[PDB]
């Protein structure tokens, strides 16, 4: 596994026996995501939310087959006071995923 979340958060990831990085800079982290797709760290990547709103960009540019880096829009510890709209993230999942803007 691998993340590119924050330069402070990845220490606990390495403490869990798990590769993690940190840049906190969006274009530089997109470059790191490019070279991390290329050195594929066990097919699972978590990318920070307010570093890349969408993690899909590097894989949809390079690797249009097989979806090997499973990309997760992970959060960070700065917004661990509020969570920043879990269910709003699910509403944008539904709208991005089937095209239809519905609520309940």
């Amino acid at each position: 596994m691998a993340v590119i979340a924050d330069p402070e958060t990845a220490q606990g990831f390495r403490l869990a026996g798990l590769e993690g990085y940190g840049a906190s800079s969006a274009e530089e982290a997109q470059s790191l995501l490019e070279t991390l797709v290329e050195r594929g760290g066990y097919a699972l990547v978590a990318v920070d939310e307010a570093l890349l709103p969408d993690p899909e960009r590097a894989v949809e540019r390079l690797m249009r087959g097989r979806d090997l880096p499973v990309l997760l829009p992970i959060a960070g510890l700065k917004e661990a006071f509020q969570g920043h709209d879990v269910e709003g993230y699910m509403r944008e999942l539904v709208r991005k995923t089937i095209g239809f803007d519905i609520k309940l």
């Binding site: 596994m1 390495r14 869990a16 026996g17 097919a43 499973v70 992970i74 661990a80």
Partner: protein, 207 residues
């Protein structure tokens, strides 16, 4: 091109009926896929909510850990732990399409110094272990969710494309063949009237 006959006309009517059955078949397939998408999305928001809870708790544990203990020694404890290789992904052959479900190895018995001279790296280790479990569960939930969603939009564009393309195309071919068969029938009933006049002329010449 299409050969204008009566048999071709019944063939085009038959495959018009096949397309009108296929519209219903694909819409029932989409009505199943929608129900399973709505079944998966509540489980996805539950998994993401448990991810938020484990994120807050593991972040609190890590901040108190490297606040009371030194950041240097918890960094050394992080750099002493192996990367725990062997996390992998295998087949889920849903709708004839392999999607990778993921799980890790994570050995639990061989912890490096369970009597750890840092008294907070064990708690942070369990916290980020639960954090990585929450990540892999949200991972193999949402890749299934994204696959079901693109299958729904693929079926929907196939329904709309099949209707808006090859329902009026088959209807235009049927109408063309019917018009030219009516043309040939009208020519035949012209020739029969001409030959009836020529039968009648024999008697008026017989006189």
């Amino acid at each position: 091109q299409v050969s204008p006959t009566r048999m071709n006309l019944l063939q085009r009517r038959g495959q018009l009926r096949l397309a009108q059955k296929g519209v219903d078949l694909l819409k029932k397939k989409r009505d199943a896929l929608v129900a399973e998408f709505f079944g998966l999305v509540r489980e996805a928001m539950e998994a993401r909510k448990a991810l938020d809870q484990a994120a807050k708790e593991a972040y609190a544990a890590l901040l108190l850990a490297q606040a009371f203990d030194g950041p240097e020694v918890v960094a050394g404890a992080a750099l002493g732990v192996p990367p725990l290789e062997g996390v992998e992904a295998e087949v889920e052959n849903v709708w004839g399409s392999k999607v990778p479900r993921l799980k890790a190895t994570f050995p639990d018995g061989a912890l490096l110094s369970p009597v750890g001279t840092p008294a907070y790296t064990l708690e942070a280790s369990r916290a980020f272990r639960r954090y990585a479990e929450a990540l892999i569960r949200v991972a193999n939930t949402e890749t299934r969710l994204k696959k079901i969603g693109e299958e729904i939009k693929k079926t929907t564009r196939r329904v709309n494309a099949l209707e808006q393309v090859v329902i009026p195309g088959i209807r235009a071919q049927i109408r063309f063949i019917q018009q030219v068969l009516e043309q040939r029938e009208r020519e035949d009933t012209f020739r029969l009237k001409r030959i009836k006049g020529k039968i009648e002329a024999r008697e008026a010449e017989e006189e």
